[PDB]
Amino acid sequence: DYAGNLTRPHWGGAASDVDIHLEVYQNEVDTRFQYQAMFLGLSSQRSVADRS
């Protein structure tokens, strides 16, 4: 209130207001929701393998 000019530790810039704060990162990656094939018992399996 009584101090419009302050000492913000991790705010850079000539008149503060730069937000150079560190980023807290805990090794989290959100990728996608997995899917599993079901057409195994819903078809007939023939293995041409290494012949034709």
Next chain:
Amino acid sequence: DFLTEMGQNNGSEFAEVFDQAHLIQLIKGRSWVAPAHLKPAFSDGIEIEATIDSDVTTQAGMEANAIAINQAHKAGIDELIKRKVPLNDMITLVSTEIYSLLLEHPKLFNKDWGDANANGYKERRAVLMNGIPVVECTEFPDAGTHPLGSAYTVTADDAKCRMVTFSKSRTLVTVEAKPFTSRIWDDEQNFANVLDCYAMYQVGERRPDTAAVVKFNEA
């Protein structure tokens, strides 16, 4: 390094491709025409057209949509029975939207018409519809193209079909020349590591007259 996530993604995408390939094969075989020299023994494909008012709000509209879905499935089953197909090895595949519209049936998900489908309306879970098991699959193709070949490209009309009633043993065969394998190898000359995952297979529709496909023509 996030290589494990990449491997999970690759496996999941290969599974999706597998399922979409089989579904596209069935949808395209819905319009199969038996060879002329095999007509008495082989019948043509089965296409059942239904109308669903998806943007309706009154209860009677919901009852109408559920009844239309059930009646279309019953017509497919009856016309299959006309061809003497055995019924002890048959599964049904309904998309999420059709599964949802089906749950408002007034004569299916309640105990006054017997057991089975208990808690179907309160749990969003159907089991049997016209004497055969029902399985919800989220991998019906849209109107794009499939990586398995240009022959698998889905048309706008093909993308409209959302229910399939086939047999697990006499309707589809999936020849297979290499299982889904993965490898990561160091590229000395190109100064990089490459992650690979490849699978060779093909799905063929044997006896395309043992499947029933329902195309819902909006409103």
Next chain:
Amino acid sequence: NTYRIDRLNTSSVKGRTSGVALEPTPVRNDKMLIVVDTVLYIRNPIDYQDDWTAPDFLTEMGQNNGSEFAEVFDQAHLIQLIKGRSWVAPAHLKPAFSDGIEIEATIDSDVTTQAGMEANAIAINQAHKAGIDELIKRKVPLNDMITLVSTEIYSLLLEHPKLFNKDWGDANANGYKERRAVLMNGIPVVECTEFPDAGTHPLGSAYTVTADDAKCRMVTFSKSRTLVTVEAKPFTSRIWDDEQNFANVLDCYAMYQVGERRPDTAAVVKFNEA
């Protein structure tokens, strides 16, 4: 002023035939970060008038402050959930991260006082079912799902001919009409009395509820992978003497910020009257 979470896209399946090369495909990624920017506060001075007024009135004020802070906490979480229904996922990570979910339902509100009071419950159930359909299309697991409903929506739901009926399978699902809706569409429901009004919220200027956001009276989200709360100052209370103003001042200040991880895991229903 930052907590960061990374994001990752998928691959794409291609096809070679006999002797053609294998065209490499990139995989894209990005990060997400929540920042804390606003501290809440309650200030309460007493102008040395406790000398004359024997009652302290200081143990009830603490309970009131705790109740108000819990209220604001729950309301801020709900506001974040319902304001993320319009979030659009970036194209460079689109195939994995989908958009937000908004489902429209028409409710007659109190204007219906007949058998049409059963039409509201059917619409509510249908909207929730459509949201679940969207979630299942996105392959989101539903083991941890939860549904929150405003009190009026709870009551309108209670008059449903197909959901509180023992014929349709009420062996363990919705076994009584006496205000115990527990699960519908397969996931639990909780009657929440903290859905925001049309006004503003103290947590920031990005929180003020629009007219449309006040209509949203139902959410459906996973308890473990939808909302993340980032804490800077835990809720603390303090009383300190003020010599200069000749008063004793009681403070209660907390500092946090709520962000959405996987905004595509929440279904929000907007009830646009009739």
Next chain:
Amino acid sequence: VAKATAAQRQEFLRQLNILAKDMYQALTQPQDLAYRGPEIDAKIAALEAATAAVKA
């Protein structure tokens, strides 16, 4: 970009960082842009001025 004075370069860096972080917070961690968008739209003018100064 290199013939500009130190003050102009510093102003450009300040505006670039401020808007990068602010718009990034707007996009990820969803903040309703109907009430954050106007706030960022005010800071666009400073970036435009700084970029114009460094371009000359």
Next chain:
Amino acid sequence: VAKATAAQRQEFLRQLNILAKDMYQALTQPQDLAYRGPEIDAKIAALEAATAAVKA
């Protein structure tokens, strides 16, 4: 900055972040601006175009 399309808010965030990192690591941990300066000067046209698209 709220009526622009998603593809417009992106590719604006992208340029803002790119030029926020690059010229920050130029001014601090010093790099010869005689050679890095023209490099950043080439990346300013895209930033100006993105800002103009967003401002509309």
